[PDB]
Amino acid sequence: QPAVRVEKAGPVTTVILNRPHARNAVDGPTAAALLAAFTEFDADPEASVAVLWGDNGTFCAGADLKAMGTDRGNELHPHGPGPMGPSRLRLSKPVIAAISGHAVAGGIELALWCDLRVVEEDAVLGVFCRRWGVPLIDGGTIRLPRLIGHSRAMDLILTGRPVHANEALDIGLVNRVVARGQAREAAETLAAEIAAFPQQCVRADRDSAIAQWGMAEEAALDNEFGSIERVAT
Amino acid sequence: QPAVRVEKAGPVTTVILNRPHARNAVDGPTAAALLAAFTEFDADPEASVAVLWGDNGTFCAGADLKAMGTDRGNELHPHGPGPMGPSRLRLSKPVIAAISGHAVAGGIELALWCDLRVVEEDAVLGVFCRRWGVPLIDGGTIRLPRLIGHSRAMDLILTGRPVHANEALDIGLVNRVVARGQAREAAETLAAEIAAFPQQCVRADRDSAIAQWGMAEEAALDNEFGSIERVATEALEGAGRF
Amino acid sequence: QPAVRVEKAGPVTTVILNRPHARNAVDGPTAAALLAAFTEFDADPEASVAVLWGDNGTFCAGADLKAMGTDRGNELHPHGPGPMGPSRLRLSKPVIAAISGHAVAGGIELALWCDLRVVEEDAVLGVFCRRWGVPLIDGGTIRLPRLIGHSRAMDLILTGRPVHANEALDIGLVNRVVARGQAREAAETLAAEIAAFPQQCVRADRDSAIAQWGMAEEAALDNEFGSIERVATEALEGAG
Numbered sequence A: 001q002p003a004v005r006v007e008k009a010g011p012v013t014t015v016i017l018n019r020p021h022a023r024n025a026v027d028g029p030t031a032a033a034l035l036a037a038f039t040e041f042d043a044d045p046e047a048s049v050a051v052l053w054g055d056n057g058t059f060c061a062g063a064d065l066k067a068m069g070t071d072r073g074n075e076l077h078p079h080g081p082g083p084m085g086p087s088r089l090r091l092s093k094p095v096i097a098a099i100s101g102h103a104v105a106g107g108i109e110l111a112l113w114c115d116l117r118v119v120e121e122d123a124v125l126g127v128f129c130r131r132w133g134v135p136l137i138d139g140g141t142i143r144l145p146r147l148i149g150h151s152r153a154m155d156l157i158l159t160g161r162p163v164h165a166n167e168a169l170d171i172g173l174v175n176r177v178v179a180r181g182q183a184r185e186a187a188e189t190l191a192a193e194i195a196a197f198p199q200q201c202v203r204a205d206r207d208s209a210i211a212q213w214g215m216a217e218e219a220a221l222d223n224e225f226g227s228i229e230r231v232a233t
Numbered sequence B: 001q002p003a004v005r006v007e008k009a010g011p012v013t014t015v016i017l018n019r020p021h022a023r024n025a026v027d028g029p030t031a032a033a034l035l036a037a038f039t040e041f042d043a044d045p046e047a048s049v050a051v052l053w054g055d056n057g058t059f060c061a062g063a064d065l066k067a068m069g070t071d072r073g074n075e076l077h078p079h080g081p082g083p084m085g086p087s088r089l090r091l092s093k094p095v096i097a098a099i100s101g102h103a104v105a106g107g108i109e110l111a112l113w114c115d116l117r118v119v120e121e122d123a124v125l126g127v128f129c130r131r132w133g134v135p136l137i138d139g140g141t142i143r144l145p146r147l148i149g150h151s152r153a154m155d156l157i158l159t160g161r162p163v164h165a166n167e168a169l170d171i172g173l174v175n176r177v178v179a180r181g182q183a184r185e186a187a188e189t190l191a192a193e194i195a196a197f198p199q200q201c202v203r204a205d206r207d208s209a210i211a212q213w214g215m216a217e218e219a220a221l222d223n224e225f226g227s228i229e230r231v232a233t234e235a236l237e238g239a240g241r242f
Numbered sequence C: 001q002p003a004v005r006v007e008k009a010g011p012v013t014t015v016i017l018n019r020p021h022a023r024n025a026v027d028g029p030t031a032a033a034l035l036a037a038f039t040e041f042d043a044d045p046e047a048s049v050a051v052l053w054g055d056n057g058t059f060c061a062g063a064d065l066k067a068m069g070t071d072r073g074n075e076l077h078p079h080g081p082g083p084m085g086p087s088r089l090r091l092s093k094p095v096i097a098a099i100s101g102h103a104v105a106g107g108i109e110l111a112l113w114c115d116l117r118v119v120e121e122d123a124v125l126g127v128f129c130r131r132w133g134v135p136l137i138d139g140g141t142i143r144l145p146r147l148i149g150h151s152r153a154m155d156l157i158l159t160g161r162p163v164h165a166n167e168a169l170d171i172g173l174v175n176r177v178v179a180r181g182q183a184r185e186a187a188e189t190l191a192a193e194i195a196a197f198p199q200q201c202v203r204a205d206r207d208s209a210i211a212q213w214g215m216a217e218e219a220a221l222d223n224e225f226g227s228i229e230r231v232a233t234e235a236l237e238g239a240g
């Protein structure tokens, strides 16, 4: 019955969202638990790669709209943590989204906060909060243009339209498409593969790819150079 | 036969370029009129989404090469407005390009300045000014890479080659492809769809998506959080529905 | 037998990497020769576009792993030049990658440093250094996300996987795919096409497309406006 649970298999930690009646929507306490799970993952020396997976046939419907306006609603912190929980956490290690069913609104934002996205053939991603007038305040306006280009990003943001798996893959919004029911396993396999590689190197390259955004090239290249030292140590 | 005219249909404002002899090329006075049309749109509280449409079977051929070297030539302002007119204006509300025929040179730049692009199946986009030796000075060198990625932007910019609708859609250069004759209508329908959503929320998300470019992620996320206060009145007005 | 040579045909300069026993891997001395070749190109007023081509059926396998840990290894300079040689050089004129065989590790970074990439249909690109535990330190972490978007870049970087030509084209990692053995010719043809346009204007647009990254839009636009002055002489030359 816990909204969030964590299962580990060697160096891959799977963080699991489970709110069957709420289509894995995330309220205040669920957000805090998601944040706690990723903070533990980040600090855990034995954990190399995480997987974020929604249980029971869907990924995440976004913020819990029933709970908004109540004591259980998402917390609104100007400098973070983000309303969905970990959406402003800059992890030292990668996370793979394992998406079944719907990843919409705050749920697409959690997907986008992950480093890679594995989706099932019938899954749907979208900015559905467009319909409701609830703004993207879990990084969607920053990550969508950077992940897939401003043009496509503006399409998804302005229209709020659904994006199915084949289009999602074609435009780079997701990285793998697998059969129905297979997302968790495919993501965990991918995570295990990334975890088998030399880890300080994975982390130096990842951290640089993320940090370079918004930097002038010379400055970005000076930072990238620091990876040598990271992997010597 | 005014070069620029404006037609409104509820909350959608259509800005129409019409210079049949010049294939909708934009000289100085036309640029000023385009700028004024969009300035008016920006200030009109009843107007939610604009459509930029070229009349008589084409979008825009670029800056008017025939007006070059005359007092009808495009104006060159170091800090704006841009030569094509509205190309350095940051509108508070979105614009959709409705592209028939050609969107080339300064004309592809107008298309890129819009938020979304709907093109007809036989239309052609391109940095044709490459052949002419006329530089991109209406944001093309900035918006092409950010819109479709640096690699494809370099292809289009270096070669100046034509891009047909098929390829344009595949690479994200355009967002919708429709049948010949249908761009204005399809763009207007898409515009009405966007205008039917809660608008302060639309504008908050759009403004952040535009502004985050070049910012460090933390500062960008701090700015994005501002959207809560932007929609506060509108969320309350809609509290019943919600 | 020289590791690097240079051949010119009119305004197109082809820089050729040839280390057939080492799969065109780049050690310290080869890197220095690649840098010198591109430095010469950059200063050559008659050279308009460069082509980077690997001889003998492959492009470049990255840093020479056998030279690594010796005094022939790549040099490590905090502020440049880059270990592969020219990878931190911001050239005043464009370069086209002509890829056969493999462009991996440092080799994919040289490909990404070029402006355009023409690849052979059986060619393979990849971040193979992921397996080796050697970091991307020739701009791959910067150029990959900017070139094809953050999502696809993270795929390639984290997994280190091989990307074939068809996928490469589809995702914008390469710009043209041609038949086996034809990358050099196809790149030289494309280079000559680009060389035939007015060049000050090409260079103004290119420099602005590069410089704008990281800049706020407004500052980027102010910089872009400078292209008018850059082309002033050329515009008059072409006036009538």
Ligand SMILES: [Cl-]
Binding pocket: A148, A149, A150, A151, A152, A153, B147, B148, B172
């Ligand atoms: Cl895009």
Ligand SMILES: [Cl-]
Binding pocket: A147, A148, A171, A172, C148, C149, C150, C151, C152, C153
């Ligand atoms: Cl991408």
